[PDB]
mmCIF file of C-alpha atoms and ligand atoms in Angstrom:
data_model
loop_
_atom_site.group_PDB
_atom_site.id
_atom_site.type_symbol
_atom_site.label_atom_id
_atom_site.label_comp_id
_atom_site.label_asym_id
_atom_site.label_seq_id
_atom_site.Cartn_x
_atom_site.Cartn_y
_atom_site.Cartn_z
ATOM 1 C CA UNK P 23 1.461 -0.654 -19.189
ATOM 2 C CA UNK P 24 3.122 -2.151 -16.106
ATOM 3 C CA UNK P 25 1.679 -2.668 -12.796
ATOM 4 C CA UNK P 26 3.914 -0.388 -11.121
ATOM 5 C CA UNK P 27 1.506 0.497 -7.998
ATOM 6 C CA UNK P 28 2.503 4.212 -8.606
ATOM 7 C CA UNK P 29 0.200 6.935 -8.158
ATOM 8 C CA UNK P 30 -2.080 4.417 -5.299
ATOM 9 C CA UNK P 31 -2.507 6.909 -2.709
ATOM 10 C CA UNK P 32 -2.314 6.375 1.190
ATOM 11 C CA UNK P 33 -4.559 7.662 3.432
ATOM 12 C CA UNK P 34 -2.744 7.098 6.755
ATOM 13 C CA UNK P 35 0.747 6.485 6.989
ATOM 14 C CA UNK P 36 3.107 4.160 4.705
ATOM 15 C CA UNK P 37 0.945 1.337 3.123
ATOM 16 C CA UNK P 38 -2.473 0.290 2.892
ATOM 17 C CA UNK P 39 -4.162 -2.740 4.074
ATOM 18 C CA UNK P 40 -7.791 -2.092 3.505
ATOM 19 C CA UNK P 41 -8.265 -0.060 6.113
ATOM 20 C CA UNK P 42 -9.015 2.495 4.302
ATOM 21 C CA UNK P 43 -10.198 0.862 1.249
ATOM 22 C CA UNK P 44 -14.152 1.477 0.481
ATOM 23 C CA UNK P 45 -15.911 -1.679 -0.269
ATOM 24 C CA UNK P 46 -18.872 -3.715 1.053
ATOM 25 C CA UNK P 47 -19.409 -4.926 4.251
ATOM 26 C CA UNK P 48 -21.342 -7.776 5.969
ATOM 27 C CA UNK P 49 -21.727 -9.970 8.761
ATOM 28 C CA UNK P 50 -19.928 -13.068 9.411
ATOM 29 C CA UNK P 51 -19.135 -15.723 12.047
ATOM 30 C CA UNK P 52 -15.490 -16.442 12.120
ATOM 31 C CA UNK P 53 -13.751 -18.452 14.811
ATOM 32 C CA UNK P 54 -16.880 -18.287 16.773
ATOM 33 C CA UNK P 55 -17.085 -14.361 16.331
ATOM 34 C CA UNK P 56 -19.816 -12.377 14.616
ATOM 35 C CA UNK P 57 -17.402 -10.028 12.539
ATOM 36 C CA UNK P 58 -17.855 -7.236 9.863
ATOM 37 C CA UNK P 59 -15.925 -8.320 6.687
ATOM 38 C CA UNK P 60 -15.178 -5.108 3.991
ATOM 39 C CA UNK P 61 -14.485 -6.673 0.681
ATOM 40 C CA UNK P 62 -13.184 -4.075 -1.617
ATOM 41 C CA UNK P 63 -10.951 -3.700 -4.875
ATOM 42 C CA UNK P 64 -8.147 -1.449 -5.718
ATOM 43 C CA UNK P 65 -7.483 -0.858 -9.052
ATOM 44 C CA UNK P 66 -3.814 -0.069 -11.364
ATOM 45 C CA UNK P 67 -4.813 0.088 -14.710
ATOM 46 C CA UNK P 68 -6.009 -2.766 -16.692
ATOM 47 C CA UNK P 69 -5.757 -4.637 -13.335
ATOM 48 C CA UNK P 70 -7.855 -5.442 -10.647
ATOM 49 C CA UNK P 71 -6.656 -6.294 -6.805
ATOM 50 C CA UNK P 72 -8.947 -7.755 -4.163
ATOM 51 C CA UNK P 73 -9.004 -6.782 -0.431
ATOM 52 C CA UNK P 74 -10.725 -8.434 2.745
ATOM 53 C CA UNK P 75 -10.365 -6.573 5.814
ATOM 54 C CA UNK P 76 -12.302 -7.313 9.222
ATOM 55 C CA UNK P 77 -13.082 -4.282 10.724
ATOM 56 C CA UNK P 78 -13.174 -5.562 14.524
ATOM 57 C CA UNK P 79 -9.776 -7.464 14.414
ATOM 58 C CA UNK P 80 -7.566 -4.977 12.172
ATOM 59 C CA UNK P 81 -7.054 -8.151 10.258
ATOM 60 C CA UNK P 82 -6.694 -8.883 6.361
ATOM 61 C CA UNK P 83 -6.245 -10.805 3.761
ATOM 62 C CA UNK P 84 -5.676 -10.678 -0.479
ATOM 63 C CA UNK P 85 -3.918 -7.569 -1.872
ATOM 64 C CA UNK P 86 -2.572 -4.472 -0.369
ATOM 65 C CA UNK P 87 0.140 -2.196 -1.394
ATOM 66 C CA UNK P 88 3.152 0.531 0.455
ATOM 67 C CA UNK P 89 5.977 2.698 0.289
ATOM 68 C CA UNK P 90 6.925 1.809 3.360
ATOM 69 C CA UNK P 91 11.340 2.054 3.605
ATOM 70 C CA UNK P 92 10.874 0.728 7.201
ATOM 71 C CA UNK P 93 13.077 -2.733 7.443
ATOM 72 C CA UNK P 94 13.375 -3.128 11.251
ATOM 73 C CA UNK P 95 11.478 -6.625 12.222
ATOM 74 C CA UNK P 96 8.718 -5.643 14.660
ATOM 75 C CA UNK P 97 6.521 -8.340 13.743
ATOM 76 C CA UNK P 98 2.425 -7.733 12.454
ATOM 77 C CA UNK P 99 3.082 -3.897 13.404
ATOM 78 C CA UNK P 100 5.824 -3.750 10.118
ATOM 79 C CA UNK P 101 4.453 -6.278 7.659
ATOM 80 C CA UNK P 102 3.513 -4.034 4.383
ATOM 81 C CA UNK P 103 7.910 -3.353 4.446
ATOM 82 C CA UNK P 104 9.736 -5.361 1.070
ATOM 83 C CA UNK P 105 13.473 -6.561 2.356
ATOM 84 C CA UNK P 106 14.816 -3.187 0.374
ATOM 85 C CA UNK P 107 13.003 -1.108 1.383
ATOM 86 C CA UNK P 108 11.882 0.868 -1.246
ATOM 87 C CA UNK P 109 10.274 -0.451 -4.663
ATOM 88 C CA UNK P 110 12.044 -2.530 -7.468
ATOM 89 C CA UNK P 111 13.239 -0.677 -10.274
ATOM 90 C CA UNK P 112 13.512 2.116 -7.886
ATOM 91 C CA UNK P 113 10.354 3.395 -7.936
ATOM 92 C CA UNK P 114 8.463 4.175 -4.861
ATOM 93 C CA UNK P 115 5.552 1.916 -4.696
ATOM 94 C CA UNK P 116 4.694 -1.366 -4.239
ATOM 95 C CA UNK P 117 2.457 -4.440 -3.647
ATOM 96 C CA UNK P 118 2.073 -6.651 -0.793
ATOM 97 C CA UNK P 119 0.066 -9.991 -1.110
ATOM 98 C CA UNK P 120 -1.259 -11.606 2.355
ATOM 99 C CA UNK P 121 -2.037 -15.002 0.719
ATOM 100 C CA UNK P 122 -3.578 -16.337 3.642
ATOM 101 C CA UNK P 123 -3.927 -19.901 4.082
ATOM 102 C CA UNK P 124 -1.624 -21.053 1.633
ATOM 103 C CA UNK P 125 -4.392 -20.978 -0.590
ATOM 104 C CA UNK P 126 -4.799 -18.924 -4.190
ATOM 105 C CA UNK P 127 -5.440 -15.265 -5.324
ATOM 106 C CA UNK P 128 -5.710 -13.822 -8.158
ATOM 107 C CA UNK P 129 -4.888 -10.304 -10.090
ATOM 108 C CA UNK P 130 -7.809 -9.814 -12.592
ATOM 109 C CA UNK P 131 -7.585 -8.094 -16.092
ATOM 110 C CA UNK P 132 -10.419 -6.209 -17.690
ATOM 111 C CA UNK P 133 -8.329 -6.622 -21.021
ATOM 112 C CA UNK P 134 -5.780 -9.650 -21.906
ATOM 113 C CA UNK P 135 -2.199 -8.761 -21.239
ATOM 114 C CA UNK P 136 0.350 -10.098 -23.328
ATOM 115 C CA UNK P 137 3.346 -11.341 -20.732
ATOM 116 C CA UNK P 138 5.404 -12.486 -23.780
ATOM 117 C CA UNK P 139 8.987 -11.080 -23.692
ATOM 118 C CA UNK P 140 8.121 -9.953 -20.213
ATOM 119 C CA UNK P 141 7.967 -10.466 -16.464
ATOM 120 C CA UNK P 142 7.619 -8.903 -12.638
ATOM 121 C CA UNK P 143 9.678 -8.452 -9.353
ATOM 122 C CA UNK P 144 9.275 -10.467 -6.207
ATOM 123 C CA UNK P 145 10.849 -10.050 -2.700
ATOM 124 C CA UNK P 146 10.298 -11.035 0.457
ATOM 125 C CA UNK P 147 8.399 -8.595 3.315
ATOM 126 C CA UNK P 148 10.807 -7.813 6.494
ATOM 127 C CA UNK P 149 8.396 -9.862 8.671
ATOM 128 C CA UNK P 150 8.489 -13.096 6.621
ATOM 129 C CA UNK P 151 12.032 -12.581 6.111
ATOM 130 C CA UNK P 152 13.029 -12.175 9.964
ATOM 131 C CA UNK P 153 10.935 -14.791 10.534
ATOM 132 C CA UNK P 154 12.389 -17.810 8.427
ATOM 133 C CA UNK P 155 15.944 -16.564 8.907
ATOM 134 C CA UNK P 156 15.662 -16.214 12.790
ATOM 135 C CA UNK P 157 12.620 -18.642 13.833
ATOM 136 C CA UNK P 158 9.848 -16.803 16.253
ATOM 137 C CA UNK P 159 6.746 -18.425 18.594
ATOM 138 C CA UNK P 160 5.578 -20.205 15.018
ATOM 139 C CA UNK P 161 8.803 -20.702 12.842
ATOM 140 C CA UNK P 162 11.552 -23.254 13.613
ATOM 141 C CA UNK P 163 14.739 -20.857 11.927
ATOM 142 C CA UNK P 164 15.073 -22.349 8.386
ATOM 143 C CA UNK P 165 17.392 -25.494 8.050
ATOM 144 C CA UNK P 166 17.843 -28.094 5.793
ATOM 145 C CA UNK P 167 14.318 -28.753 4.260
ATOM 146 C CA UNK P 168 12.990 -25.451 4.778
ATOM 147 C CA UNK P 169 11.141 -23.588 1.763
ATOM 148 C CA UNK P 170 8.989 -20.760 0.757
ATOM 149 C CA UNK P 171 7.622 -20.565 -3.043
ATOM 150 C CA UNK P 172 5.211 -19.171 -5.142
ATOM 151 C CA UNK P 173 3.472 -20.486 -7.713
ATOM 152 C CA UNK P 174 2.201 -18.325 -10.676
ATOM 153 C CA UNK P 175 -0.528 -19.506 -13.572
ATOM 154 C CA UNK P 176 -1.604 -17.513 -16.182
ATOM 155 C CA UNK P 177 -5.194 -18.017 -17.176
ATOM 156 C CA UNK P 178 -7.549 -16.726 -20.127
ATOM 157 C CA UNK P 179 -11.158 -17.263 -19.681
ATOM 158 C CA UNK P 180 -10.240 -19.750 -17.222
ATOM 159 C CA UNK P 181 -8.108 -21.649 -19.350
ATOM 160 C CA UNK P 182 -4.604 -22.445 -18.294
ATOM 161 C CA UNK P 183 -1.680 -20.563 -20.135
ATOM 162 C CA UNK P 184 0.843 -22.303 -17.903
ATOM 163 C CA UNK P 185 2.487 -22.685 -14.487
ATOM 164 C CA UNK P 186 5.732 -21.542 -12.932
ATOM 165 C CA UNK P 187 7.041 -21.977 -9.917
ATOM 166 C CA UNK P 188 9.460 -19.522 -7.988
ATOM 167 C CA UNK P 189 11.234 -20.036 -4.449
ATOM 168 C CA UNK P 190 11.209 -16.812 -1.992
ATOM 169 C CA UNK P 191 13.556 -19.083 0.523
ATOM 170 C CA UNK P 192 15.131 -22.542 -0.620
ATOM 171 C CA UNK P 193 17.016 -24.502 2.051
ATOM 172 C CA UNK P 194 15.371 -27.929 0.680
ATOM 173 C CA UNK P 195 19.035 -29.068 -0.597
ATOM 174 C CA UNK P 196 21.054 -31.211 1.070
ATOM 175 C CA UNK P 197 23.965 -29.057 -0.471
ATOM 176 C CA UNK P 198 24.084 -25.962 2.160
ATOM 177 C CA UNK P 199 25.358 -23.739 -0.974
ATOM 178 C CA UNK P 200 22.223 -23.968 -2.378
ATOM 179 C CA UNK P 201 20.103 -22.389 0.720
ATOM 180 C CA UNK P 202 19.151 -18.746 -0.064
ATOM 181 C CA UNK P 203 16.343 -16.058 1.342
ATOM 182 C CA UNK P 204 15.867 -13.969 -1.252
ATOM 183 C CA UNK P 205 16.248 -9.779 -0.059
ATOM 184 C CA UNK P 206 16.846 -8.020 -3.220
ATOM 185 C CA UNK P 207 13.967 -7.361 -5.763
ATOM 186 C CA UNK P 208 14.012 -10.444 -8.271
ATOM 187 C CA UNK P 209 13.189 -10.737 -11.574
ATOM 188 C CA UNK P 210 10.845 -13.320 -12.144
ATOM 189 C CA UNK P 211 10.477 -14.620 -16.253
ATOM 190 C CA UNK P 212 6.827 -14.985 -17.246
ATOM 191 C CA UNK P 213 7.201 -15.154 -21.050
ATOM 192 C CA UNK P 214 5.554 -18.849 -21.181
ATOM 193 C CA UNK P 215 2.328 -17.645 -19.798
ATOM 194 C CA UNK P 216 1.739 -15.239 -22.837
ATOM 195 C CA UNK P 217 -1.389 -13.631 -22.910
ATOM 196 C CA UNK P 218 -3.771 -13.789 -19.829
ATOM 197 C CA UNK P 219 -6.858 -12.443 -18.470
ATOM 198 C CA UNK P 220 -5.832 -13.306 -14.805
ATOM 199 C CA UNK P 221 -2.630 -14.157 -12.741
ATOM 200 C CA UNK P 222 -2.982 -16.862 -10.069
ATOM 201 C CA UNK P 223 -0.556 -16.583 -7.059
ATOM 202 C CA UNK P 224 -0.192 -19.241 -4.288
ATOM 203 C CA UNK P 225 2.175 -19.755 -1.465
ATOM 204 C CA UNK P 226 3.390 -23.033 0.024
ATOM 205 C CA UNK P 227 6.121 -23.447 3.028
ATOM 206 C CA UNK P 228 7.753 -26.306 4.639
ATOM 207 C CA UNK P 229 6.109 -24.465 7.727
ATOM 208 C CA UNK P 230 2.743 -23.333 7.831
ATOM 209 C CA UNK P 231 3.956 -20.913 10.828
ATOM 210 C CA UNK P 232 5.757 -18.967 8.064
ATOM 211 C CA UNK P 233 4.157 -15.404 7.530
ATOM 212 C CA UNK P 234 2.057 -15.993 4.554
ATOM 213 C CA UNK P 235 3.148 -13.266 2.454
ATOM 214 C CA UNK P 236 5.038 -11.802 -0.692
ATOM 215 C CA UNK P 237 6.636 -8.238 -1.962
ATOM 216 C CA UNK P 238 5.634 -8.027 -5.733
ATOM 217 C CA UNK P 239 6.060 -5.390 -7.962
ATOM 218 C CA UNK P 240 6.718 -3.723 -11.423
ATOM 219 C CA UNK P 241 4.192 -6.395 -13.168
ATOM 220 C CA UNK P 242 4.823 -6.700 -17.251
ATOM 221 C CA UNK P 243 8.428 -5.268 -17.492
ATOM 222 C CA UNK P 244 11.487 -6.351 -19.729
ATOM 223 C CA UNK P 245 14.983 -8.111 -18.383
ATOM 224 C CA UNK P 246 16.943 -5.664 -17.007
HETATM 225 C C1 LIG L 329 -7.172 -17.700 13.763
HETATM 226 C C2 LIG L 329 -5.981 -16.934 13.194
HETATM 227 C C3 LIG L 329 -4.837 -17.530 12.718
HETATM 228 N N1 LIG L 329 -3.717 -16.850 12.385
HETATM 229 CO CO1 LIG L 329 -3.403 -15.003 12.404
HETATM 230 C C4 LIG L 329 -3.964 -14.977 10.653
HETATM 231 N N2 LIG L 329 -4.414 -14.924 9.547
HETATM 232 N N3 LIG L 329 -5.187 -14.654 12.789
HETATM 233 C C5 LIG L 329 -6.094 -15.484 13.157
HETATM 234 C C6 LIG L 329 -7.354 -14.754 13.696
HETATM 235 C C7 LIG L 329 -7.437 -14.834 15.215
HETATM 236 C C8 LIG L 329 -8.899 -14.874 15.639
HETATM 237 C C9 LIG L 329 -9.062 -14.784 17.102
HETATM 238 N N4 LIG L 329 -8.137 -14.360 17.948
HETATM 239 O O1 LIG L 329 -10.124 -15.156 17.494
HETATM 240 C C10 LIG L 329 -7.230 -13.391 13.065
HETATM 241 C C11 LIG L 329 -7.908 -13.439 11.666
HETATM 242 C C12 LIG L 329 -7.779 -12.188 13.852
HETATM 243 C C13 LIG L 329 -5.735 -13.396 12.814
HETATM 244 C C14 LIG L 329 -5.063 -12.274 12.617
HETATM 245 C C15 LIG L 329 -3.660 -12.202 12.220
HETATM 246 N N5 LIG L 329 -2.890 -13.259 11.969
HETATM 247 C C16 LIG L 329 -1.783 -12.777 11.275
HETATM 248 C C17 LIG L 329 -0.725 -13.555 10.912
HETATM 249 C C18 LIG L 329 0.410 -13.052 10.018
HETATM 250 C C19 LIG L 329 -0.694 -14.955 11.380
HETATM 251 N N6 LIG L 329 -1.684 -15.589 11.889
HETATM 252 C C20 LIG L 329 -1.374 -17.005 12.085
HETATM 253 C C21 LIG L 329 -1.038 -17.234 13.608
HETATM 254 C C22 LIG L 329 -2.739 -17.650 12.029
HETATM 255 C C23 LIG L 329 -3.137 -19.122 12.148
HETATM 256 C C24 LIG L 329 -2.659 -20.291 11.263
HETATM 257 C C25 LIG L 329 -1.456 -20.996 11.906
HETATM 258 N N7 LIG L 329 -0.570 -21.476 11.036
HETATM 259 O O2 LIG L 329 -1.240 -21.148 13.140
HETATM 260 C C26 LIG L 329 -4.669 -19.031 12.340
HETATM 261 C C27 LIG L 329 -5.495 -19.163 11.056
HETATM 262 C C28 LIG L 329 -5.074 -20.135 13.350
HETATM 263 C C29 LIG L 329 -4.639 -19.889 14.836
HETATM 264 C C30 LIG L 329 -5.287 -20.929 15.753
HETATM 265 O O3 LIG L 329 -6.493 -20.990 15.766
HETATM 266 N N8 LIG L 329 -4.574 -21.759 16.525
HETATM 267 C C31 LIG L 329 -5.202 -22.760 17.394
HETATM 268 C C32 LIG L 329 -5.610 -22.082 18.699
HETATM 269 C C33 LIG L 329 -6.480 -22.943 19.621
HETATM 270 O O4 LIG L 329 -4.356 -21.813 19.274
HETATM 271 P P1 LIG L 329 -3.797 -20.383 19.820
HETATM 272 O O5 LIG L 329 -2.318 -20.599 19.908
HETATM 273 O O6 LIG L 329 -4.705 -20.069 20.966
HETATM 274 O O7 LIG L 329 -4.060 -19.445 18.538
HETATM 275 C C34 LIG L 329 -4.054 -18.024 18.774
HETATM 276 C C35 LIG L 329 -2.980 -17.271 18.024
HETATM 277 O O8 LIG L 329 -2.715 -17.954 16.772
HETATM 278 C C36 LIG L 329 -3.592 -15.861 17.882
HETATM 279 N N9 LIG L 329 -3.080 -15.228 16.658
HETATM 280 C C37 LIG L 329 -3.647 -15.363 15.454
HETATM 281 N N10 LIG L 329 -2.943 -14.783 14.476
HETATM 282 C C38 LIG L 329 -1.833 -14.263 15.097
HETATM 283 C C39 LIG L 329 -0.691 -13.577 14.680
HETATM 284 C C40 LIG L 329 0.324 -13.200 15.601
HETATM 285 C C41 LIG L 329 1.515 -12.449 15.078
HETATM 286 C C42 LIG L 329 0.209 -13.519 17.035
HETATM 287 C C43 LIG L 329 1.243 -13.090 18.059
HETATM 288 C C44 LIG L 329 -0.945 -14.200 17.437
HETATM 289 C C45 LIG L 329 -1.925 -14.588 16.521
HETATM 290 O O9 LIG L 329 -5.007 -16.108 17.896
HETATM 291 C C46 LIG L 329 -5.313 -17.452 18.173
HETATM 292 C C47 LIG L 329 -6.549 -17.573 19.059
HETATM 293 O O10 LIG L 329 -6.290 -16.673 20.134
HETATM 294 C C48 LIG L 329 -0.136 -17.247 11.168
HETATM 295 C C49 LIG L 329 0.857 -18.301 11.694
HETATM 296 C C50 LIG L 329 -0.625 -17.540 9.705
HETATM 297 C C51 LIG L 329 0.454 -17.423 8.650
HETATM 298 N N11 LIG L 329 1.209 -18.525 8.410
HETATM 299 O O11 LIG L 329 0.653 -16.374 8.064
HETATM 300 C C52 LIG L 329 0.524 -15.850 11.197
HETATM 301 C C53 LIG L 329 1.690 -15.442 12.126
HETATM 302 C C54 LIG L 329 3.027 -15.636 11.423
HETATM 303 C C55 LIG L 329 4.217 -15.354 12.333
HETATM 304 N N12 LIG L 329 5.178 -16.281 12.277
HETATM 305 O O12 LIG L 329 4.314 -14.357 13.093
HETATM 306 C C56 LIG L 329 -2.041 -11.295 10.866
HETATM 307 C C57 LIG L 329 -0.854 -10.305 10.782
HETATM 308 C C58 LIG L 329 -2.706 -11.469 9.486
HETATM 309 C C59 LIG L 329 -3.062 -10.155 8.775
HETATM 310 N N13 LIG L 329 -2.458 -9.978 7.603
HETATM 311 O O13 LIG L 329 -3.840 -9.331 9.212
HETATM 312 C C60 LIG L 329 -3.054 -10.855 11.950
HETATM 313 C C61 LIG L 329 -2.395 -10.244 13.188
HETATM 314 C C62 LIG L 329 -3.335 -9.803 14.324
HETATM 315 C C63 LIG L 329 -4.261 -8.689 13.848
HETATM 316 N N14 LIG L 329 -5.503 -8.755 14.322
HETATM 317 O O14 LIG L 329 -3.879 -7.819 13.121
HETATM 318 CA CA1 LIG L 330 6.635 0.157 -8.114
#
């Protein structure tokens, strides 16, 4: 029932970007390059994850997912690694959203799922971890004022079921007790959202430097 990622496979290596996804590709201009853009979807079920890879680059955007127990900081070359290391609930696999832009993506159901009683894991990657905690050419290290949250809305046939907001990194208090990056898998509580067609995610960051990305797995599961 859950969106546990398990039984994805990977072509090459530890994770997948899109790469190796098949979808459809055209021709766009993009900061003044000509560029050919695979759009493709990966799917877990009932659920539906979109992918946008540029061939010439090695870039992407959207949904990907790993296994990857890698958790040394190396930048873009380790960036599909959660903080553990491993998936939540110990399972193997998991999803990586590259939310680029600060702007929103969605998981899309072919069927309503109920989220009542229920909810999903969130972590932070290694990269976007390393990155607030430490600073890097983009990221002033996190200090008083510094954030990273998500925002999740539930929606059935694009109708809001509701909108919760969860913070990755908080260091907005003036209280330095209340700062935290978060490197464990966390349970996140989406009972209010009840039953939805689609998921909306969407980052925001005191810093727009900040690696624009989130660890999420084990969608639709009880408290632990
Ligand atoms: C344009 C852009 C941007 N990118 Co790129 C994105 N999306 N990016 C791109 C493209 C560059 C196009 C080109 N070279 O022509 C594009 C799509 C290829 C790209 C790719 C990547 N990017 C990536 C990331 C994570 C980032 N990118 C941003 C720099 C991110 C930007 C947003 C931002 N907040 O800064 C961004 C939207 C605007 C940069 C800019 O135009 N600056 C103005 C320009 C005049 O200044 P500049 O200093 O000369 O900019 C150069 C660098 O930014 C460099 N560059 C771009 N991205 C990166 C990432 C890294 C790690 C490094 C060392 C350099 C770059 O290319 C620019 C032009 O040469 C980033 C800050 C956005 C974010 N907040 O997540 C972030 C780096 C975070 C960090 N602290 O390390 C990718 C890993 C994304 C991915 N998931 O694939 C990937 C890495 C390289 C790769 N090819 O695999
Ligand atoms: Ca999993």
């Amino acid at each position: 029932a859950a969106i546990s990622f398990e039984g994805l496979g990977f072509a090459s290596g530890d994770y997948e970007k899109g790469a190796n996804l098949s979808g459809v590709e055209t021709t766009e201009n993009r900061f003044g390059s000509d560029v050919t853009v695979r759009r493709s979807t990966f799917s877990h079920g009932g659920a539906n994850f979109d992918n946008e890879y540029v061939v010439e680059w090695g870039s992407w955007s959207g949904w990907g997912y790993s296994r990857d127990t890698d958790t040394v900081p190396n930048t873009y070359l380790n960036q599909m690694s959660a903080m553990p290391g491993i998936g939540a609930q110990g399972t193997t696999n998991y999803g990586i959203g590259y939310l680029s832009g600060w702007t929103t993506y969605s998981i899309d159901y072919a069927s309503a799922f109920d989220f009542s009683g229920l909810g999903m894991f969130v972590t932070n990657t290694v990269y976007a971890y390393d990155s607030m905690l430490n600073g890097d050419g983009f990221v002033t290290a996190f200090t008083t004022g510094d954030y990273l949250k998500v925002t999740i809305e539930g929606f059935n046939s694009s109708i809001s079921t509701g909108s919760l907001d969860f913070y990755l990194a908080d260091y907005r208090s003036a209280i330095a007790a209340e700062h935290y990056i978060l490197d464990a898998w966390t349970f996140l509580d989406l009972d209010t959202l009840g039953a939805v067609d689609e998921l909306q995610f969407t980052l925001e960051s005191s810093q727009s430097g900040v690696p624009s990305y989130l660890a999420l797995d084990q969608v639709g599961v009880v408290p632990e």
